[PDB]
Each structure stands twice: as structure tokens, then as C-alpha cells.
Design an enzyme around this catalytic site. Structure first.
Site, PDB file in Angstrom:
ATOM      1  N   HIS A 163       0.832  -1.193   0.000  1.00  0.00           N
ATOM      2  CA  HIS A 163       0.000   0.000   0.000  1.00  0.00           C
ATOM      3  C   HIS A 163       0.871   1.248   0.000  1.00  0.00           C
ATOM      4  CE1 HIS A 163      -3.269   2.719   1.727  1.00  0.00           C
ATOM      5  NE2 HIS A 163      -3.899   2.092   0.751  1.00  0.00           N
ATOM      6  N   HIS A 212       6.541   7.654   4.988  1.00  0.00           N
ATOM      7  CA  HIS A 212       6.224   7.210   3.633  1.00  0.00           C
ATOM      8  C   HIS A 212       5.608   8.366   2.848  1.00  0.00           C
ATOM      9  CE1 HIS A 212       2.161   5.900   5.520  1.00  0.00           C
ATOM     10  NE2 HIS A 212       1.943   6.978   4.811  1.00  0.00           N
ATOM     11  N   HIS A 269       2.896   9.955  -0.166  1.00  0.00           N
ATOM     12  CA  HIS A 269       1.622   9.781  -0.849  1.00  0.00           C
ATOM     13  C   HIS A 269       1.762  10.356  -2.251  1.00  0.00           C
ATOM     14  CE1 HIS A 269       0.036  10.747   3.486  1.00  0.00           C
ATOM     15  NE2 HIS A 269       0.302   9.470   3.423  1.00  0.00           N
ATOM     16  N   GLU A 301      -4.401  14.603  -0.465  1.00  0.00           N
ATOM     17  CA  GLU A 301      -5.520  14.598   0.471  1.00  0.00           C
ATOM     18  C   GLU A 301      -5.419  15.844   1.352  1.00  0.00           C
ATOM     19  OE1 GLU A 301      -6.954  11.523   3.722  1.00  0.00           O
ATOM     20  OE2 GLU A 301      -6.991  13.687   4.084  1.00  0.00           O
ATOM     21  N   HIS A 354       4.555  11.826   4.587  1.00  0.00           N
ATOM     22  CA  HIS A 354       3.867  11.523   5.832  1.00  0.00           C
ATOM     23  C   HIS A 354       4.826  10.865   6.819  1.00  0.00           C
ATOM     24  CE1 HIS A 354       0.199   9.292   7.775  1.00  0.00           C
ATOM     25  NE2 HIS A 354       0.740  10.177   8.630  1.00  0.00           N
ATOM     26  N   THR A 368      -6.130   6.550   9.774  1.00  0.00           N
ATOM     27  CA  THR A 368      -4.741   6.619   9.310  1.00  0.00           C
ATOM     28  C   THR A 368      -3.858   5.559  10.014  1.00  0.00           C
ATOM     29  OG1 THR A 368      -5.152   9.015   9.247  1.00  0.00           O
ATOM     30  CG2 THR A 368      -2.923   8.273   8.734  1.00  0.00           C
ATOM     31  N   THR A 369      -4.494   4.491  10.475  1.00  0.00           N
ATOM     32  CA  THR A 369      -3.832   3.401  11.171  1.00  0.00           C
ATOM     33  C   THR A 369      -4.585   2.101  10.891  1.00  0.00           C
ATOM     34  OG1 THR A 369      -4.935   4.365  13.127  1.00  0.00           O
ATOM     35  CG2 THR A 369      -2.517   4.445  13.059  1.00  0.00           C
TER      36      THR A 369
HETATM   37 ZN   LIG Z   1       0.410   8.244   5.012  1.00  0.00          ZN
END
Ligand SMILES: [Zn+2]
Length: 260
Positions: A64, A94, A96, A106, A119, A198-199
Site C-alpha cells: 500500500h 512514507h 503519498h 488529500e 507523511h 490513518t492506522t
Molecule cells: Zn500516510
């Protein structure tokens, strides 16, 4: 309802909501910002970022996204502002990247929307356990740095260079002696809102610190992020893009921004 498109199930996963009983509450997206729907917070003590001692170890691709792990056996990469609920050390980060150059970041501020974002995940050390932090509304703290295409980012070269060696999920690469100082933007402004899913679990353990100053990255750089795959080695080629879910209404997002 409220889902014409969802990252997972095409029109929004129903089974997800019924698999996590906590759906009894209201949260899907990490954040949704509007200039009018954002409340400024006083020039309280700024976020002390000390990651000059940050020791990166490895970079890994997990389907992902692609994460680079830093060592936190000591106070190497530390982040703590004034009034808060702990010291959040940097463990990994990581990027996006949306498939179209006008989407992907986003955290859309009324009309904002960028093609990419960095992020960085920080963990509250005072509980000495990452899963314990996940069980806490203030357990985690993350840095969201928008990426805008234009001037090249010399500091980003390091990760861009190794992207081709972490193309498919499952494989790993050594990534030592990385300095996050080369990722610093010009202005250090930010929004601060607790974020949802976000987890791994559907909960709000994350504290989103989104910088208002996007960093400049070049086309040559961003294009190479699009070379990453969701698939493993020897699997049907898919491009690691978007990986984000639409933002949610006032039905559990109200923005705050603590800066002078
Ligand atoms: Zn992220």
C-alpha cells in the site's frame, strides 16, 4: 451514503463498517480542512523537531506504501511542541502520490489538493509500546508535508534514487545515514487535528500535523514515485498511486492551527 468512490470497495466498503463495531462512532478520514472551518490556536510553544541524530536503518515496500524505518533506541528523532500528551519520536515515514498531478495529497483545504505528500509517523515514547499508543487518542503524531511540482528537491534525491530498488512489495533495501533536514520547507506553519483510520484499526490515535508550506519537487522526481508497484515481484503490474480515501464532512472534523 456519502461514498461515490472509496479506496478499497469501489463505492465504499460496507463490510469494513460492519467488521469494526467502533463504526458506531463517527470517523472515516484523517482530516478535511477549510479556511473558514479552521480555528487558529495561540502562538503556544512550537514543535521542537530534533532529528539531526536520526538514524535510518531500512526501507521496505508493503503493498500500500513504502516505509523507511529509523532507529529509536534513544532520543534520536524527537518531536514535541508545547502542551501535548507526550514526546513523539520518529519511527518511519512514507510518501503519498496521486495518479493525476492534481490529486493524491488529500487534506484538502477548501480548494487545495496536491499530487503528493510526505507523511512522517511519530510515536509517543512514554508508553514504551507502539500498540499501546494506537489504543490512545493522542498516541501518535504525524507530519504531513505537501509536495508541489516545480523546482527539484535535492534532499529528496536520496529516496528517489532507491525507489527503483523497492519497486515491488515484499522486498527490502538498506537505507542508512539519511538526513530528514534536507526535507525542510521554507515556512514552518501547520494544522493540528486528531486523525481517524490513518492506522490499521478504525480509531483516532493519530495527531495530524500538516505543514502549510509545500515543498518543491521536480517532475523527474515525482514520475519515479509512480514506478512503484502494489504487486510483488513476478506479479501483474500495478502502479502505487493515490492510496487515499475522500475527505469527510463536519460529521467529525473541525480544524485547529496552532501558530503565531
Ligand atoms: Zn500516510
Amino acid at each position: 451514503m456519502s461514498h461515490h468512490w472509496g479506496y478499497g470497495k469501489h463505492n465504499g466498503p460496507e463490510h469494513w463498517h460492519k467488521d469494526f463495531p467502533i463504526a458506531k462512532g463517527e470517523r472515516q478520514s484523517p482530516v478535511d480542512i477549510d479556511t473558514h472551518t479552521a480555528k487558529y490556536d495561540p502562538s503556544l510553544k512550537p514543535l521542537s523537531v530534533s532529528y539531526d541524530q536520526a538514524t535510518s536503518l531500512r526501507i521496505l515496500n508493503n503493498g500500500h506504501a513504502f516505509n523507511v524505518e529509523f532507529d529509536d533506541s534513544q532520543d534520536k528523532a524527537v518531536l514535541k511542541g508545547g502542551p501535548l500528551d507526550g514526546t513523539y519520536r520518529l519511527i518511519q515515514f512514507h510518501f503519498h502520490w496521486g495518479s493525476l498531478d492534481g490529486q493524491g495529497s488529500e487534506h484538502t483545504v477548501d480548494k487545495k489538493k496536491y499530487a503528493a505528500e510526505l507523511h512522517l509517523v511519530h510515536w509517543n515514547t512514554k508508553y514504551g509500546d507502539f500498540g499501546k499508543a494506537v489504543q490512545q487518542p493522542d498516541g501518535l503524531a504525524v507530519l504531513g508535508i505537501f509536495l508541489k511540482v516545480g523546482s527539484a528537491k535535492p534532499g529528496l534525491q536520496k529516496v528517489v534514487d532507491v525507489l527503483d530498488s523497492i519497486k515491488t512489495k515484499g522486498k527490502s533495501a538498506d537505507f542508512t545515514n539519511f538526513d530528514p533536514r534536507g526535507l525542510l520547507p521554507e515556512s514552518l506553519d501547520y494544522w493540528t487535528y486528531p486523525g481517524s483510520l490513518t492506522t490499521p484499526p478504525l480509531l483516532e490515535c493519530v495527531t495530524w500535523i500538516v505543514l502549510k508550506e509545500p515543498i518543491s519537487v521536480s517532475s523527474e522526481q515525482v514520475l519515479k514515485f509512480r514506478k512503484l508497484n502494489f504487486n510483488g515481484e513476478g506479479e501483474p503490474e500495478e502502479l502505487m498511486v493515490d492510496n487515499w480515501r475522500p475527505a469527510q464532512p463536519l460529521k467529525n472534523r473541525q480544524i485547529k492551527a496552532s501558530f503565531k
